[PDB]
Design a protein around this ligand. Structure first.
Ligand SMILES: [Fe+2]
Length: 187
């Protein structure tokens, strides 16, 4: 239960393996360790594979089945849909740049516009946390000049979720694909 400062990304991954050795998750401890890792671009450059047209998901570690650790690359103006997290824990740590996170309530089954509950600006090295009980979110790089890179951890791993239409609240099931795995482009 002894949380030390990750010296490197590899060190963080080792610590993560220990934290997720069990059946449950100490959210605050995982968030603290993610936040404590000081982004060193040389260590994660391998995974930082950008696409011109949308943000990419780049698998770093499969956490021995307990979590997916991945690097997301957000080009200028790239954003996500409004989405849930399939009953998983979801951690987002900024490695480079800034991201806007917008929170939404779960829609009522009446077709109505989804109005923002709140929004915040995630800054370099900060780690955000979300789960379905907290709400739905959209994450966007609103910068015109700076690409953003985040380190994301989802537990349990999931490869499907729901996208929500902001104007009705209607949801559609989406399958997530990885742009790369372990540094390898996977079309
Ligand atoms: Fe998300």
């Amino acid at each position: 239960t002894e949380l030390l400062k990750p010296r490197t990304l590899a060190d963080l991954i080792r610590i993560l393996h220990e934290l997720f050795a069990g059946d449950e998750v100490n959210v605050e401890e995982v968030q603290a360790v993610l936040e404590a890792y000081e982004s060193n671009p040389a260590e994660w450059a391998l995974y930082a594979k950008f696409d011109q047209y949308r943000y990419t998901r780049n698998l770093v570690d499969q956490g021995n089945g307990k979590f997916n650790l991945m690097i997301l690359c957000w080009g200028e103006g790239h954003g996500s849909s409004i989405h849930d997290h399939t009953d998983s824990h979801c951690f987002l740590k900024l490695l480079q740049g800034n991201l806007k996170e917008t929170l939404f309530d779960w829609p009522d089954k009446k077709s109505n516009e989804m109005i923002k509950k709140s929004e915040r600006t995630l800054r370099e090295n900060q780690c955000a946390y979300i789960n379905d009980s907290i709400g739905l979110h959209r994450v966007e790089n609103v910068s015109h000049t700076e690409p953003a890179v985040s380190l994301n951890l989802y537990s349990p791993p999931f490869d499907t979720c729901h996208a929500f239409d902001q104007r009705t609240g209607h949801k559609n099931k989406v399958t997530m694909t990885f742009h790369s795995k372990f540094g390898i482009r996977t079309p």
